[PDB]
Amino acid sequence: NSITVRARGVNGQESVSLQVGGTTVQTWTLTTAMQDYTASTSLTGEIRVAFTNDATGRDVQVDYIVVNGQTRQAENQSVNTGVWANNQCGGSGNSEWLHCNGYISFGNV
Ligand SMILES: OC[C@H]1O[C@@H](O[C@H]2[C@H](O)[C@@H](O)[C@H](O)O[C@@H]2CO)[C@H](O)[C@@H](O)[C@@H]1O
Ligand SMILES: [Ca+2]
Ligand SMILES: [Ca+2]
Numbered sequence: 001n002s003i004t005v006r007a008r009g010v011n012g013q014e015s016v017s018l019q020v021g022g023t024t025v026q027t028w029t030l031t032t033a034m035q036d037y038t039a040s041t042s043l044t045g046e047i048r049v050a051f052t053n054d055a056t057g058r059d060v061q062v063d064y065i066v067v068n069g070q071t072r073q074a075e076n077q078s079v080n081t082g083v084w085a086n087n088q089c090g091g092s093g094n095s096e097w098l099h100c101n102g103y104i105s106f107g108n109v
Pocket of ligand 2: 063064073074075096
């Protein structure tokens, strides 16, 4: 499988991990502009994009991923454990943003 993540940080120090079934497939440091990050995997389970180094000044915006050619918008995903919403991390779904450490789930490969 081929997976492309389109994402940015706000300050350029942010780290994200592409995970499949809980296995980290690849980690990247983001820049302050949307860019594409691509990895391959034989794994087939639940895809997550996780922000792992939250700190002052650091937040992640994930536009979408592409899975074997299918674009899956971050904001179309019901599960986002990092968005700051309703005064808490993970207070709602359907967001591009990871403010807190947490992940967006994009369903199975
Ligand atoms: O401190 C909890 C959490 O805050 C996040 O920023 C929030 C902020 O707390 C809130 O006052 C403001 O209006 O919303 C922002 C998010 O947009 C911060 O991004 C997290 O790193 C931090 O854990
Ligand atoms: Ca989007
Ligand atoms: Ca933050």
